[PDB]
């Protein structure tokens, strides 16, 4: 078969060089040496920036280069700028049977500006919702840079498994990112436990909040 | 890789039975197969032996004109057609693969019992409690289940209520071909006359349900 | 088509490599000048002490026999070697391929190659009754 | 449908590095544990030894060389039962049908070697009877189906049986006559080189 | 006339090494040198643990080893464990005639626990049984270890030859053993003797009970 | 070339089934299909437990099994046992040029006891050390089971590059494990940045401590 | 069947060493032998590989010019002459047999350490108790033994009196070749100024004794 | 003393009963697992099959036969090293000795292929010196030591 | 090697027929088939009664016959008489290397009398023997017919491996047999153990007696 593995997130500041790799198996890149690269900003049409490993289509800047070594094909950028922040896709002709196969996708992150911490706002369920026999904990994460965040939930000390849904980081109007997480629960679980906690992992430093059940006696 | 036997059971002398062996985990048509049996208190003995395609057949002298081994390579089945059964054929029968001139893989076995002995019910009796105190305050009592056939018979005490200190001995086989077993339960000395002990003897082949009582 | 080429290259002169194409064929026609080829130790003494075979005479397959002889005593000297068919008369009938064997320092072992004649023969290495003897037969 | 497999003929073999054991003349026979394995190709020969290559006696010395044989690519040979051959015959009537409706109006008839008269009943026009038979006398005698990774043919049974290539029988069975792809050059002193005959 | 012999029962504790022998007749185990050993737990399929005298199938531990010197083939088990208590069978390919012949079997007992004397309960004939013109003395042997027992009946002091039906020892659910013995008689013999004695022999030590007509 | 990758540590409870994987590049497992697995208890000689992908040496238990899928070899241990605690090594004959190559090694942990998350203590450079133009950060990790942990350091949030050295886990006196981590710095970098942080990843969780000048 | 290694030890870069591996339990002259090493934090790697006769020799480019493998089949011995040693050669070295194109049987291994380090006493610093409250009343204090060679360093707190919560971690080996070791103890926060805690650091190999009092 | 073992030649071998796998014409080749072991003797042949023996076609059907080979008695072949030959020489003097004291008076001299002078000294009569050599050229050419039981 | 094993004691009644077997356990017996049987009354010369398995010396009665089947040679005596009370030795030519091999020996008992169970008398150490720093357990058996016995000793539950002395039974003055069993020990082992047991095996039935400090 053919599976193309390329990293999820790679970062660098303008003016430097960054390398986006593309690792395949068995055949994939070394049988035909026929790799191509595509750039796609969010929303627009994909554009051919390289084909045949090294070659370059008309119009594409000479800052764009690529090489091959065994299984790995690599896209190289030099003189990085703020326009280059987009999604990049690896493509390679596998064999006569399958065909060109793609990589999952890489989001390059230009370090044009600064690093923000995730501002977390954890909310408990309201009593009117518990009247309706349901409970949801809401973890609102806002004003972080970059949009590389891992969300975790906990039940008094323990990771939560079922019911957790997550969004993908959506951009703000002040050029930062924001996200919203929701933990679905039943009213008995919210009362039998001591407290629940949401955690936000962002460039290593973990920010978390905690909410506990209260009652109007 | 496993073999499953079937077809074993009870039959009278001069009767017929047909064993089956279901093979899985390998190419059945590539291996010699054989039937092995073990009589009670007797050494293991291969009685039938067939080639991978069935063109070579081998039997012992004990069974040659009576047993017929066959195989269906299409449905992965080995058969032992047993006819004119005798008392010497009472044994646990195995189907086994054969490779490298050794008996390689076996089965759990299927039990074949040939007995002239005909169906009969038991004679349930009580047994008077004498002393088993050993200083003290303990006594033993139970029932006797005599002259029954075939297996099994299930004992129970007071509809399964009294199960503390209960013992149900495995049955013996007599020279008449009929079985017999026993049961006991230990109870205190001062609580002998304060309750009733009703052993239940449940015999399914002849539909017997006896609930005899034990007391001094 | 790798196999087809290899069967077509069977019987063809092979070549190997290191780090220069090495050739498994052809020969060299040489002419050798020997006039300026002298002996060493033509001017030492004969070795008259006791000598010991470190390695006994053994067939080489070329029709010759090799041997290794040790001289522990008897400083800077030459080892006489002769091959005959009679222990009494030391009449050499063999070809001493190692012309004028020499011992340089004491406790030295030297290699001698000799072509003895056909049939039964005797290999003599020595002068007195410290002389070595080894009976030989060649087809 | 599912011809019975008969042979596997190796046409591309991958070799490990060769292993050598050797002895001086009159010292014994060389031995390797690789020599006892089924999937190893070995040669057992003698080498000219002497003082010049580490022996006290000039003569022939035992030498053994072994290389593990694993087949990279093999051609499969299938054996054919003519009585199992089937064919499909498409039939159609000229009425007025547009070309684009031809696939709808075609009755596809399937025959075995033991099938009788088969019917192609067309709605409105009655039905026509077909009584057919394959002709497999002058192209289907002692023959195999030889297939590589992407190609297949009908070959003579005796032609494929006489191939100078290693062959196999079914399961993880030993590769027979591995010398057709593995040769050993004559030993020099204590080393033997392997000649791989190629794909 | 071509059958292997091997000991009925051989015993060991956890930890030591034990050897089961298999003696055949100078042909039986001596001709082809392919002798196979089988392990069978009660109710399960026999498992090939050794073949070709000393060969070992895939998955079999080093503790199982085989040897063969003339008539005798030997299975040697080191580091004895509770899993090893089972039945062990010998097998040899005699010749081209009878092909394979087995041994009588050996029950390996592992002495996982300590010596326990047998407790005996001897019951008299029931009066209701005697009114059917039959008598049966019931001797019940309970809670002994190991399960090697010699049962003996007596007529006021005199060993009884006939009417004896004794079962083989059986495994309890507390991991001890139990056995029973029945002595059939006519009611006249029961009344015409002073007493009857069931006695139980176990590791040389004998337990005795005695009942009398009343 | 030839690099065989396999996880640092895999854990299982007594009696369950576990699978260790061995992933390589291109050729190297797929060409020759002779892959061997080894077992090493601390201080003892490695033991051949599997060879030729699925073959079993004499006396190796039936619980050990092996499989291959393209460029991945797998060692599956079923019915975990206390004695199974060892390092497990994967080896494969790459080609006629590299011959043999090994995996990084996998430490199996049989959970003969319960879980333990890491407890961390981070220390800033002391004044008496700064008096000698030196600054060392000490991150101490204790009471964590199983003993296989990832340490990461941060330069106010940044992945540090030069100056980190970490020990290996060692069994505590109460059948737990401990580990140290040291970040060497110069006193000016310690005062320049806002703060530093140890960061301990364990079984997918994460623990961090922060110290500020 | 066992292999035994010997000869490993401490050495400087550019030094020399000679490993010996003794074999017993099999015909040593019939089997290929090889040397295998594992450096700290790295994977296993074969460096030398010799045939049964010793006629075929194989090295890796890392050790091709510096190491020499040999064997003496008369004395059942395998040698590895290590010359021009480097810091990268610090590893645990195995001698192993080779058959069936696999590495079959191993030895226990012998350690080889290449160090340019020098005998040096430790520098001791206090770890001022920062809060370990967690609600509350607990503080963890410690000590940093730093930049010493060789092992060991013995650390005690107030003549071995306070042995409740003391924890001396195993030492790290730095790129310089020196060791650094920490040690901490836990005490209530309401008793920080009421008692004195002193590091009793002793490095015998340098006759260095240090007593560092830890203040908040 | 201890010649190197070279070969074993089997002159007595016992056989197990043959085992057969067979197939109809045009239905493939028959297989046995015994066919892969190196210590079994097997043959690969074809058989005349038809309606009379259970096949739908008249033609050659594959048949395979295997029998386990086990050597009962073998002849060992030892290579000799001509340089390792030893010999023993008896030496005695005619003095007056009664026959019953011959063995006591005999001096037993041992030589290697490259020994020095071996001397037998007799108390009261001095000593004689022997310089000896085997003759193993015509009698000991390219030869094995072949031994049966 | 070659080992011939035959039962230690067999017995029969006058007029009956009896068989004593001789089981061979060596490498290759089954080669020469010249097995010989011998008869020995106490204090006299052995007498050849059979050779070459079935053949009979001149003058030997026809009541003595011998057969073989496999690794077992059997001596059968019919019309049993009181004169046949003797020892019967088996002998077989094993191979060219070690020659003829003998069996252990069998004592035939002709029941010219009824069966007698062994009476046993076990005694404790006398308080005047521990004074001499020794202790001996004395088990005395009398009135058994035939004189064929097996003696075992037990230390509270367990068979004693050292110190047991058994005699060879000596006849009485009332045509029965007697034997003595002694158990030397040290006084500390006598005091440490809860009890010791002498138990006596005679014709399947065993008889036990016990002493304690």
UniProtKB/TrEMBL annotation, chain C:
Domain Glycoprotein E immunoglobulin-like: 43-138
N-terminal signal peptide: none
Cystine connections: 47-77
Entry superkingdom: Viruses
Entry's localization field: Host endoplasmic reticulum membrane; Host nucleus; Virion membrane
The protein's name: Envelope protein
Organism the protein comes from: Yellow fever virus
Lineage, top ranks: Viruses, Riboviria, Orthornavirae, Kitrinoviricota, Flasuviricetes
Residues of the full protein shown: 250 to 392 of 493
UniProtKB/TrEMBL annotation, chain H:
Subcellular location: Host endoplasmic reticulum membrane; Host nucleus; Virion membrane
Disulfide bonds, paired cysteine numbers: 10-71, 24-55, 42-66
Name of protein: Envelope protein
Native source organism of the sequence: Yellow fever virus
């Amino acid at each position: 078969q053919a599976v193309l593995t390329q990293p999820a997130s790679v970062s660098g500041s303008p003016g430097q060089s960054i390398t986006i790799s593309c690792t395949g198996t068995g055949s994939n890149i070394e049988t035909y040496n026929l790799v191509s690269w595509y750039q796609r900003h969010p929303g627009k049409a994909p554009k051919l920036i390289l084909y045949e490993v090294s070659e370059r289509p008309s119009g594409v800047s000479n800052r764009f280069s690529g090489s091959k070594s065994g299984n790995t094909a690599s896209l190289t950028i030099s003189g990085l700028q703020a326009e280059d922040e987009a999604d990049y896709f690896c493509c390679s002709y596998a064999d006569t049977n399958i065909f060109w196969v793609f990589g999952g996708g890489t989001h390059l992150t230009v370090l044009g500006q600064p690093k923000a911490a995730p501002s977390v706002t954890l909310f408990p369920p309201s009593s009117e919702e518990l009247q309706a026999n349901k409970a949801t904990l809401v973890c609102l994460i806002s004003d972080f840079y970059p949009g590389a965040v891992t969300v975790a939930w906990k039940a008094d000390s323990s990771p939560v498994k079922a019911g957790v849904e997550t969004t993908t980081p959506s951009k703000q109007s002040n050029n930062k990112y924001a996200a919203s997480s929701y933990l679905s629960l039943t009213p008995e679980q919210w009362k039998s436990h001591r407290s629940y906690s949401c955690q936000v992992t962002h460039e290593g430093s973990t920010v978390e909040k905690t909410v506990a059940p209260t009652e109007c006696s | 890789v496993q073999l499953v036997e079937s077809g074993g059971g009870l039959v009278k002398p001069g009767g017929s039975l047909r064993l089956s062996c279901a093979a899985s985990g390998f190419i059945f048509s590539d291996y010699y197969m054989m039937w092995i049996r073990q009589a009670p208190g007797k050494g293991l003995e291969w009685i039938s032996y067939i080639s991978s395609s069935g063109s070579q057949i081998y039997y012992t002298e004990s069974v040659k004109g009576r047993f017929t081994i066959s195989r269906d390579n299409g449905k992965n089945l080995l058969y032992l057609q047993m006819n004119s059964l005798r008392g010497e054929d009472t044994a646990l029968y195995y189907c086994a693969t054969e490779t490298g001139w050794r008996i390689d893989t076996w089965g759990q076995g299927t039990l074949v019992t040939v007995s002239s002995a005909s169906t009969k019910g038991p004679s349930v009796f009580p047994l008077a409690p004498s002393s088993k105190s050993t200083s003290g305050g303990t006594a033993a009592l139970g029932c006797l289940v005599k002259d029954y056939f075939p297996e099994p018979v299930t004992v129970s005490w007071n509809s399964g209520a009294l199960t503390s200190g209960v013992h149900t001995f495995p049955a013996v086989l007599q020279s008449s071909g009929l079985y017999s077993l026993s049961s006991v339960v230990t109870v205190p000395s001062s609580s002998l006359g304060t309750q009733t002990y009703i052993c239940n003897v449940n015999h399914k082949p002849s539909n017997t349900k006896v609930d005899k009582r034990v007391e001094p | 088509q790798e196999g087809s080429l290899k069967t077509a290259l069977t019987g063809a002169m092979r070549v190997t490599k290191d780090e220069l194409y090495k050739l498994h064929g052809g020969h060299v026609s040489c002419r050798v000048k020997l006039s300026a080829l002298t002996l060493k130790g033509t001017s030492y003494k004969m070795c008259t002490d006791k000598m010991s075979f470190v390695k006994n005479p053994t067939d080489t397959g070329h029709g010759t026999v090799v041997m290794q002889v040790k001289v522990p005593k008897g400083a800077p000297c030459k080892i006489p070697v002769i091959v005959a068919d009679d222990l009494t008369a030391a009449v050499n009938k063999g070809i001493l391929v190692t012309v004028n064997p020499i011992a340089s320092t004491n406790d030295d072992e030297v290699l001698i190659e000799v072509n003895p004649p056909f049939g039964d023969s005797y290999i003599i290495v020595g002068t007195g009754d410290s002389r070595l003897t080894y009976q030989w037969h060649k087809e | 449908d599912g011809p019975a497999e008969a042979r596997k003929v190796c046409y591309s073999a991958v070799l490990t590095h060769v292993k050598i054991n050797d002895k001086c003349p009159s010292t014994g026979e060389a031995h390797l544990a690789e020599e006892n394995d089924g999937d190893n190709a070995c040669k057992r020969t003698y080498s000219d030894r002497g003082w010049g290559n580490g022996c006290g006696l000039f003569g022939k010395g035992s030498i053994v060389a072994c290389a593990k044989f694993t087949c990279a690519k093999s051609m499969s040979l299938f054996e054919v039962d003519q009585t199992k051959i089937q064919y499909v015959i498409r039939a159609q009537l000229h009425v007025g049908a547009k070309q684009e409706n031809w696939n709808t109006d075609i009755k596809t008839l399937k025959f075995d070697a033991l099938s009788g008269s088969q019917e192609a009943e067309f709605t409105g026009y009655g039905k026509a009877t077909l009584e057919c038979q394959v002709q497999t006398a002058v192209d289907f005698g002692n023959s195999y189906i030889a297939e590589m990774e992407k190609d297949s043919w009908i070959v003579d049974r005796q032609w494929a049986q006489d191939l100078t290539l290693p062959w196999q029988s079914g399961s993880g069975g030993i590769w027979r006559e591995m010398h057709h792809l593995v040769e050993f050059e004559p030993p020099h002193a204590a080393t033997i080189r392997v000649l791989a005959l190629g794909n």
